Amino acid sequence: QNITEEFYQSTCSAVSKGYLSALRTGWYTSVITIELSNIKENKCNGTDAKVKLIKQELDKYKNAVTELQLLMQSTPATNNGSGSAIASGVAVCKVLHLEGEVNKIKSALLSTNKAVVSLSNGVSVLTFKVLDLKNYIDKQLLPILNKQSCSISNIETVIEFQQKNNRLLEITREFSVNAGVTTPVSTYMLTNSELLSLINDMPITNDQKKLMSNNVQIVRQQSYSIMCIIKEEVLAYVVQLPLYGVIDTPCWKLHTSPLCTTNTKEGSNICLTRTDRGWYCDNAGSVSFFPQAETCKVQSNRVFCDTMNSRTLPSEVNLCNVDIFNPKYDCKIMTSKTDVSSSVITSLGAIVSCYGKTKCTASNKNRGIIKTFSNGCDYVSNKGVDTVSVGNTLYYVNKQEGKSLYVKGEPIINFYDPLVFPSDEFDASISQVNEKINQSLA
Amino acid sequence: QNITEEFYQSTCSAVSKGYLSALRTGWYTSVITIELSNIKENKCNGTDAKVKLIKQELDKYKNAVTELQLLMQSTPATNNGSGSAIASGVAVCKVLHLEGEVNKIKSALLSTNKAVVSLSNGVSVLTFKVLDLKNYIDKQLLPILNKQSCSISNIETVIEFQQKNNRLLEITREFSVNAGVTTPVSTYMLTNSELLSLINDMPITNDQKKLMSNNVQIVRQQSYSIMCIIKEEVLAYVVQLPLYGVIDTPCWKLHTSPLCTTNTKEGSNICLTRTDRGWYCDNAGSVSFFPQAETCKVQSNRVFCDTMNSRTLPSEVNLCNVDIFNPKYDCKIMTSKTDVSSSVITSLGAIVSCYGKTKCTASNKNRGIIKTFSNGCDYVSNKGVDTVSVGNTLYYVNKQEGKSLYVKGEPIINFYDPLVFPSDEFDASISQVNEKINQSLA
Amino acid sequence: QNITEEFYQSTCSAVSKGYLSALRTGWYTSVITIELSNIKENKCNGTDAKVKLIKQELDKYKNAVTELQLLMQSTPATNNGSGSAIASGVAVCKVLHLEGEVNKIKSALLSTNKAVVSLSNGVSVLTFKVLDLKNYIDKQLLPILNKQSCSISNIETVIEFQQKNNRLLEITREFSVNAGVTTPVSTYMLTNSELLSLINDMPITNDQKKLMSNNVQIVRQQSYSIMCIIKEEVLAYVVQLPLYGVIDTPCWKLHTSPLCTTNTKEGSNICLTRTDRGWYCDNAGSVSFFPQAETCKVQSNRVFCDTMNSRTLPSEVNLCNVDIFNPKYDCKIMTSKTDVSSSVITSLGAIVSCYGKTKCTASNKNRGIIKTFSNGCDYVSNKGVDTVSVGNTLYYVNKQEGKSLYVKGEPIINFYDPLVFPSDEFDASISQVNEKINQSLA
C-alpha cells in the first residue's frame, strides 16, 4: 500500500516502487449456451396487428441466427487466429465442431442449466445455459402459429417475447461488428451474477477468487468472448477468462526523459535518454518487463499485466536505477541532438526537461507559480504542486500520496566530449557508446 | 478561408497555409445527475403477466445499478488515472466522495432540475438532472408493489417504465465496456438539447459560444464522460468539455516525402527526408507542433487540436520551409538508402517520390493519364487531376480548391558526396550531417 | 489449399507459402435512402397515456434527425476527408448536395424501393430504400394528431411505431459517435439480405460475386458507411464496398527474428535482423508488400489486403529468402546489441531466439517438454508441439496443418568481425553494411 518514488538526477529518470503484481499466466475457457428452437418457415393466412408484431419480432430471431451463421463461416472460428491470445478458446471452439459434443453439453444442461462437462479433448469446461429461448418459443409461440389460422391472443405475449429475444439480438450485434471476438466481455455476453458465479466455481484457490471478485471490471477488460457454432438448437460461445499465476510480487515503473547539455542554441548540445521505460515486475527469479503501456492496468496499488506482451530480463536489470555504469548489466540508452523541452508525469511527481528559451514552471492552484525550472532535467513532487507547464503545454500532476526521494547526482551527459560523442544512436548502450568513443579516439 | 500550398522541390516537402486555429488549453467540468430510488427487495405473491413484465424490467434497473457500483470500485474513479486528460474531471469526481457534497447537489436540483453549485473545493460547477427516475418509480410503481398483493394495472405503465429506464440502461452499458470513461460523449450521456444548453451557460465569451455551438460534433469527439458515484439515491457522472483558449491564429501542415538521388539500381543512391511533419500553429509567441495526426481534427478551414500532445517550438522553425540550411534553426532530417516509390496526398495536391523502375502517373477521370512522373520527387496540384498511381497503389487527390505554388529549386541531395554521406541517420539534422562529413574528410 | 513453410537458419527468418490473394483495388458506391416525413410541431390539448407514449417516441424521431443534421454540418461530408479511403464515397456524397439529385433518387424509388440511378456526375449508382417511414407516419400517425384533439387508439400502433423507428435510431447513434463514418458496416446500416442483394446486382463478374458472398463478414469489415444529407424528406447515406481486382495470385508472409552471436554476457555479442516482415503478394508483374498486419485479413488460405497501405517492390525482392547476399536486390537488415530472448509464432511453427541465461523450451500438452532450445535462433514445426515458452512468456503454436522445411545454413552473423561491425543500424542493408566495414578497415 506504501507508494514511494526515487528520482535519479544523474540519469534523468525516476522509478515508482511499492506496487503489487497480478500477472496473467493462463486462461480459463467456459462455454456459454443459449437454447434455441429450429423452426419451419410458418406463415399465417391473415394479417392481424397482434400477429404482425410477432411476425416482425420473429424476423429478428431469424436474422440474428443467419448473421451468427455467417460469423461461424469466417475467422477466427476456422483456420486463422491460433497464434494469438484466443488460442485456448479456439481449441474448445474447434472441439464443439465434433459430434456429439453439442449433444454432450445439451444433455448436461436440461436439468440444471449450469454444469461442468468433460469434452473428448480432455478439458473440464464449465457450461452455462443463460437463456432457454426454445422452451419459451415452443410453449407459447409455436402452437399459436401451427393452426393454419393464428390466434388473436393478448399482446403481453409480444412484449414478453421481445424481452427474451433482446439479449440474443445484442450478442449477435456485438459479434457482427467485432468479427466474432469481443473484448471487454460485455454484460450481455456474461452478466455480473453469471460472471461472479463463474469465478466462484473455477479450479482456483480461495485467494484468487477474492482477487478476481474484487476486480470484476478488470477481469472483464482482460477477457475474450468467442463465437463458435449454431448446431442442433444450441448457440454456444466461449468466454476466455484470465488466470493470474503471479500475485503479490513487487513491481515498479521506470520513467525516463531526455538529458541534454545546457546551452542555449541555436547550437550543438548533445543528449542521451534511458530506454526500455515501462513496468517491471519480479517473476520466477527473473524480471518481467512490459514496454507497452496498454498491457498493464493499475488498480489501487496492484498492477494487472499480460505476460504475452512481456520480455524476460535478468534481475540485474534493476542496476540501471542505482548505477548506470555497472558491468553486470549493459544498460541501454539512445542519443540525439533534439534539445526540445518536455515533461513526464510520474506517479508521485513530474520530471521536467527544460532546454532552450522555453518557459517551464510548476504552479499551485491557489498560490500560483512556485517553481521555475532552469535549463536541464529536474523533478518536483506532487506535494503542494497541482500543474506543470512546459511552453504552451499544461500537465496535471497525479495527486496520489507517497513519499518522494530526490537522488542528487551529476548528469552523466557532462562526462562525454561532444566532439567525439555519437549523437544519433537509435538503440545503443553504455558499453556500446564508450567503445564507439575509443575507436574515434585513434 | 483562403487555402494555399507551397511545394519545395529542393527539400521534397510541402506546406498547406491558410488555416485557423482552435487549440484546447483548458477543461470545463459539469456534473450530470440521475435521480434514483432506493428500493427494498419487494416481492409479490402471485405471478401475473402484467406484473411479471414489471418484475423483469425492474431487474434491469437493479442490475444496472450493481454494474455501475462495480465501475465505482475500479479506476479511474479511485487512485490511478490522474496524470492523464481526465485529471480535471477526476478532481470533481473525488470531491463528490465527500459529504455532504451529494446532498448539496441534490438540494439544488429538486426545484429547477438544472443549477450551478459551489463545491467544498471551490469550483463553480453546473449540475444537471436529466432524469428523475425516483419521482416516477415512487409515484406509480412503489405503491402497487407495497400491497403484499400487487395490482393488475394497465400495461401502459410497463411501456412508460421501459422508456424512462432506457436511457439509464444505455449509460450503464457504455460505461461497463469503457472502464467508466467514454469518448466521444454519446447523445445518451448528454443530448443535443442538453449539450447546447450547457454551452450557452458556460463562463466563456460570446465568441467561444458560437464556435462550440457551430461545431457540436467536434466538441463531442473531444469531450469525456466519467462515472463517479451512486450515493444517496443520486447517480452522478462528470462530463469534461474542452475550452479553446487559442482561436484564429494561423496554422499550417507540413508534408514530407523521401528525396533520393536518381539512378536505377540495383545500386547505391543516397536519400534524405525532412522530419517532424504534422500540424504547426502559432501560440503565444512560439509555435505549437502536433506530430500525431490523431490529435488535430480539421473542420472547414479551422484546425481543432489538443495542446496536451504538442511540443513548443521557437518561431524560427518555419525557416526550414524557406531555407533548410539556415543557422538560426537546426532543421532535422533522416537518411536512408531505401529507394522505394511512394506518394503523399497533401491538401491541394500530391507529392510523388518515384524511384527505380516504378510506374508513377497522375490520371484524370475522363481524360486518362495526364502526367508521367520521372525519377525524383515531383508535385502536382489537384487542378484537373483526380487520381495518382504509384506502382500498384492508387491515391485519390483531395478536391478542395486552393491556389498552389511550385517553388523550383535544386534537390539538396545532389549537394552531398555519396562516398562520405551518412546513409542511416534515424533522427539527425543538417548541422549534424555536415559535421559528420567533416570528421570523415580527415 | 496447400500451406507450406520454409525456415532459413542462415537469416533467422521464415516464409509461409501457399496462400491466395484477394487485394482490394477499387471501391463501389451505393446510396441507401430512408423515406422520412417532414412534420409541423403539432401538439395535442390533452395528456393521454396512449398519446403520451407517441409523444415520447416521436421526440426520438425528432432528435435523431437533429443529430444527423449536426453530422451533416461536420466532416467528412464537407471539406476535409478527401485524401483518405472514403474519397469515392465523399464524391457521391457531394453530388447529392446538388439539385435535383435528391429528387432524382426519390422518384426512382417510389415504385420499386430499389433501383439504379445515373447522377449528374456520370456514375451509375445503385439506390436502396430500406425504410419507408414517411408512408407509415402519414397514414397512421399524422391524421390522429391533426384533429386538434387526438384519438385514444389502440396501443398496438405505439409498438408498431417503435419497431419502424428502431432502425433509424440505431443508425443515428452509430453515426453520432463515429463522426458520420462507421467501419465495419453494421447490420443496421445494411442487413444481410440487403448486402447480399447488393452484391448480386453489382457490375462484376460471376466469380467475384461468389467470392464476396462467401465472405460477407470480411466484406463488412472492409466497407465504409458515410452519412450525407437530410434533404426533402429523404435520408441518404453512402455504403462503400470493396472491389477485389487481384484474385488468386500467390501470397506469402515473411517472419523475422533477431540473429545474434552466441555468448553468455554480460558482454558484447552483435546482432542483425531482417526487416520488412509482413505479407507479400504478386501483383501485375511486381510484388505488393504490406508491412502493417492490420491491413491484411486471412480467411482460410486466402489473404484479403488493401492496396492503399502497400508498397510496390520488384519481383527480385523474393531473393532475400533464397540468398540474402544477392546483388540483384539490396536486402535490408537492422543491427543492435540487444541479446534479449523472444519467439515468433509463424503459420506452421515457431521461431525461437534464445540468448543469455533464458530458459526456452517447446512443450507438449500431455507429454511435457520435448525440445530445449540452445543459444541461437532455432525453429520447430507445429507437429506434436502445442506451446513454446521463452523465459516467463508462454506462446501457443498455430495448429493448422502444413508441411515444414528446415533450410540448414550457417548464421550470417558469424561472417562479420565484431570489432568492426556496426551494431546500431536502424534501417541498413547488406551492401550498406559491407561498405561501412570497408571504410573502417582503412
Ligand SMILES: *[C@@H]1O[C@H](CO)[C@@H](O)[C@H](O)[C@H]1NC(C)=O
Ligand atoms: C508505510 O506506510 C505507513 C503508514 O501506515 C508509515 O507509517 C510507514 O512509515 C511507511 N513506510 C515507509 C514509507 O517506508
Ligand SMILES: *[C@@H]1O[C@H](CO)[C@@H](O)[C@H](O)[C@H]1NC(C)=O
Ligand atoms: C483570397 O480569396 C479571394 C476570394 O474571394 C480572392 O479574391 C483572393 O485573390 C485570394 N487571395 C489570395 C489567394 O492571396
Ligand SMILES: *[C@@H]1O[C@H](CO)[C@@H](O)[C@H](O)[C@H]1NC(C)=O
Ligand atoms: C498438396 O496437398 C495434397 C493433398 O491432397 C498432397 O497430396 C500433395 O502432396 C501436396 N503437395 C505438396 C505439399 O507439394
